[model samples]
Target: HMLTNLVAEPFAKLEQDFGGSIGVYAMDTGSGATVSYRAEERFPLCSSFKGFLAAAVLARSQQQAGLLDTPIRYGKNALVPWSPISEKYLTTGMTVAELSAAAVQYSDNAAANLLLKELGGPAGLTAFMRSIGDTTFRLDRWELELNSAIPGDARDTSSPRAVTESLQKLTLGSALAAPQRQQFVDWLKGNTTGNHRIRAAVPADWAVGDKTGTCGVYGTANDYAVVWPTGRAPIVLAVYTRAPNKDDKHSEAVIAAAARLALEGLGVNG
Candidate 1:
């Protein structure tokens, strides 16, 4: 239902840019509240799939009862090379701990892929998703390569204020447990991708941690962020856009604008 026949028309932009769509959600992990625009709206997961991938690892770790720093090796072709993980450490050595670090801190694909395999494949991830009671989420057609691999909108979904919902669970220590949850949250905080927007809106001194998802056309090209601080209240934000052309080029700017709007709307601008 692209209004202008320009599903190409972006939702927000800085310089008349055109691209894809974005659906974002953000919330206070501890308070069970979210400052959201499209919290439950469904959108592509892109590499953001890695977030769940991490979750599966954490869940398995809880059951397997082990630490994340166990040593691991770069088995021959056991891992792919296109991923940032492969680029940085495919030929090198890393422990599960290190893989987590690389996968999260650097958004390493190889690291995530390896973690996926070690965690017992997609079944592990699917089980974790079910444990959370997420119903609309389906992964049957999720192409192995995703982005281009998966077809149709069986992937697009995340409404009913999904932002606050998931974080509320995570903050409650219900997703896994503090230690298990931290394994993912800490990694999420350390996540290095999809920062183009939030960073621009906030003061250089303030810090935020959340996973970013955005991609080319049908990929993860928008952004979803959860803002948190040492002394201040936490915030969850999920942004989505399905504009035509180069919509994502404006995502960073979109994120900044949305943050400013949300804060101003709440009169929290100090």
Candidate 2:
């Protein structure tokens, strides 16, 4: 479609100037449009898959008639030392909501595993990924395991196309209904990692819900939801940078620039 012209043109110009590989993609949740550069292509998911994993947990909780308040034990050592949840005290069990928060807000690997465990663990995640409606996903045991791995390797994977499908469903509120989807969407509001590409592209109170991924090596990646003004159309953007000179700040700048350009082109505003 004409979507790529919104961001890709600029990206090409920038890449020529910056001299590195850059991956960028975007889509309209309401209209189903896409702008991609091998963005349809696959890449290691890193933490982006947490969005899929988190939605699955919310889905299963609803199936079991479970409350968002359903609590599970969280130990301090569940993940790496830097994880926010790792700093908490002993003798505590957080609700499903909290686990979801930890999984997303902090992008904690252990929290992802625990929530995967809570959603019937590997089995539930397996079933949910299978039902994602996009048959092209690389949701093998290796990918899921890599997603939960405390340490990472390039083998960890996901695709912009896959993320687009999953996020599109959530944006439409069709990934589930009533309690579960609503709960997850509301919980997405608690996300603390908002300084990245997508949030910076729009106004402060424009109602964007999203997750961001950063590893020192692979560049910064983002997947998100945006509720724009005028048509009130919901938009989903999946972005990545395969560039060599990448880190969170550089990545943030790339995606933020792409976001601002895309939003303006789409005629959206605060």
Candidate 3:
């Protein structure tokens, strides 16, 4: 509570300047210290849900052997607007593991929908979150449609606190088996889309793995990461933002600044 109070003012000021509401939750895994501001408030998950989607795929692999190596072929219709990795490999197709990597690392829309179909659907992903004890995460729709990010709509949304807690569980805690957990971390570490968000706030030498989401509407966007600072335990954090206006823009700089504030609030020494 004391740490929350100390960070409340700065977070509020940052949100004010950005013309939006920012939610943040950061945990120093070693010290167990935290910084929270509007952490429980729901914000659109947007493409951020892809990270958990990949985790669910890994969880299922534990039961079904060679699932990751299985080849998946989809039609041209499956490729969405931002399907960077999937589009190039459309003719030949990619393995389940490759799709998962593209979904997490590149936020590839088509790969997400394809993998979502494998797990079941939006409800299936939600069930995986429930299995891991996260009650706040809900994915009611697929890519593109889910990124609508309308104000006051809770269709596909979760809180910053929930995101960080689940991330910690999958990446460092017991939610995943050791092998699957390391694979998940490896995929996140190779992510190519989060450089300007949470990654921007972290020091260059520190190891980091992150996933980012941009809704392109209602100022909704977010970044969540596991950060390891030299000579200290790792830190897990989430920073999410949304504005009241329909056409408002989401700012990567704002997300980075909020992440910096979160790290500072936790006494991580930048």
Candidate 4:
């Protein structure tokens, strides 16, 4: 076979140390030839939900003029750990565009809550996703406040297939207006925080845009991306894991390695 990592075998090498179950969904944007491993099962998607939230906000902004530029307040009520917004800035006025960057780039909980609020809440965001034919991803909360649920409890969940389609739409801009599409892509491409996951393990020169989610307590880790190799069309991928315990480093390695395998399967290399 020309592609070395065509199936789930590549990840089997790490099974001894990983103590978790891994799943993947990848689509070649040009031909739409898809591949997957445990791709249909629902998995808790922690901060990965922020990516969908970002898109929903942008889509809604189209009907209401200047919604993306409107100033929204961020404060203690929305504050949560692993957030850059609360780290450097206090309660302050920020535009929807700025919050989108903060939320996606750093997975900022406070920034995500503010944007979710502007989009009308969980129900509003869910409608926006379903409007575009995404039925596998669910947005049910502001942030990772469900650590108490059992490891497999379905709180905020998404399947690899669901995220793949959402990311594919994001790359094609099929669900966003021209200006809003550009805004969404710009924020995603500027994601500076997820260096250790998808993009890190793949070809360094390839233009990669991605979002990551890691929750240590719930044993959930996820990374989804759109990778463009200079002249080639983008490759969209989703790697998700539900580990046996709260060991994030192991889960991260699983995602990174899974991403590398997907790229290799497509004959994409560093």
Candidate 5:
């Protein structure tokens, strides 16, 4: 009943259990080792896109020191549904940093949308992404709350390879300065989501900083993370899943199991 060494068992079980499409990209930062399955295909990123949003804002802040500290309003006119935040202070305002915190830590939809506006809207994110020569990812939609688009409408999506590469580049201090890169890692560590995904099967001694995303019913469950193992190099892992049904538990556990495989494949003990 236990799978201690078989590399393919976990992902196989994933599809067997959920009958869903799965994509995974895992890389060891120390040795440049990689393991992947359908990594080039695309899937919805959901709130996972907020992680990139935060990076864009922070990178741009180098040009504006006070950008993160500046205040902005979450107008009543901008109200949207399913906001655990913004609803509390519909009329009050908060700083870009605060908004960024909510967007990342809490996955606050309104905060994300407002922050997107600060970066010149979704177009801004798209432009920044292209500037980096990353073409597989797209950030076309705004916050989820105000999303009135139909099932077939454009959605935020990315390939596992694209996401893993982006995270690796950021962690290597190429996309952002070392300090800001550390700040970005700190922000990712603060993520309250992904408990059942990348962070699920990781050991207490190992460290994981990650972001998670869940598209609505019958959509996708995804996560991206930087995993640190004992005496080994950290690894960047991204898992994207699209199930036939709205079963988040299955999707998340699939990702967690894959993380275990990634670590084992890299000769990094859990």
Candidate 6:
């Protein structure tokens, strides 16, 4: 108990300074050591759900051959705000793989919706998480709608601990087939939106793949990552924050600092 408090005390100060609640969970895959602070508290997923969305698609592909290569063509009504990659290729169409990539890499709203349709909406994604032995993840609505991020609302929320554990399973454990696991990792590694969050806390030489979410309201935002420190097993971590004020702005630096603290708690030098 004392050891746990010793590790969690700094996180309390960190969150107070940022004027928000911060949730963090990190695990050293090699030693099975973990650091948790508000780790089981629910926080809005925002766009981070897209990472597991893509993983679910990959899981389906294992049963349905050529699923990833099937091209999907959608009309203008399908495109929504922040659908950058999907909007560009509307005329030419994109394969399932492309939409998944856009969802993971660019956080494209339209791509996520289109793929959600493929999986049978929010419930389908929830079922996928269940199949992977994660009971905490829930996707109750689609993009833009899911980003409401109202304080105290449990919609589209998951705990930091569940997010990290599932990420570790998909990226390093046996939850995904070998080929799909590598593909998932590749998509995460190519993400362009997380450089300022968890990525910022990591050293330049280490390898990392991360997905970030910004709710654009209530200071809700999050990042989950798989980090490799050379010559040792990888570490999986998640950092999430939310403030009480509706107009509160989310901070990338706060996320980065929390991530650093998580790594420090795990005794992983940056």
Provide TM-scores for the models: 0.75, 0.80, 0.98, 0.90, 0.89, 0.97
Clashing pairs in 6: none
For candidate 2, which ten residues in a row score worst on lDDT? 142-151
CA lDDT of every candidate:
0.55, 0.61, 0.94, 0.75, 0.76, 0.94
lDDT by residue (tens digit), candidate 3, 1-270: 554535443888999999999999999899788999999999999999999999999999999879999999999999899999999999999999999999999999999999999999999999999999999999999889999988888899999999999999999999989999999999999999999999999999999999999999999999999999999999999999999988999999999999999898888887
Candidate 5 residue-wise lDDT at 241: 76
- Give candidate 2's total backbone clashes: 4
Please write out the lDDT profile of model 6 over residues 1-270, one tens digit for every residue. 433423543988999999999999888899788888999999999999999999999999999989999999999999999999999998989999999999999999999999999999999999999999999999999988999988889989999999999999999999999999999999999999999999999999999999999999999999999999998999999999999998998999999999998888877888
**Candidates 1 and 6, the one with greater lDDT:** 6
Which residue runs does candidate 5 get wrong by more than 4 Å?
1-10, 145-155, 244-250
The weakest ten consecutive residues by lDDT in model 6 span: 1-10
What is the clash count of model 4?
0
Residues 1-270, candidate 4, lDDT per residue (tens digit)? 233235444665654457767778888777666667778878777778788888888887789888878887656656777777655666567788778888888888888877777778877777888998898767676665633324667767879878988888866757888887777777778888678889777677887788988766545778898888877778889998776665444367678888877766666555
RMSD after Cα superposition, model 3: 1.1
- Candidate 2's TM-score reads 0.80
Considering only N, C-alpha and C atoms within 3 Å, which residue pairs clash in candidate 5? none
lDDT of 1 by residue, 27-86 (tens): 444443334444455655655556666766777778676647676777656555435665
Model 3: residues >4 Å from true position, as ranges?
Answer: 1-9
| lDDT, model 3, position 259 | 95
Ranking by lDDT: 3, 6, 5, 4, 2, 1
Cα error, candidate 6, residue 52 (Å): 0.3
Per-residue lDDT of 127-206 in model 5, one digit per residue for the tens? 77776668887777786632322233345777998999998887664888887788888888888977888888688787
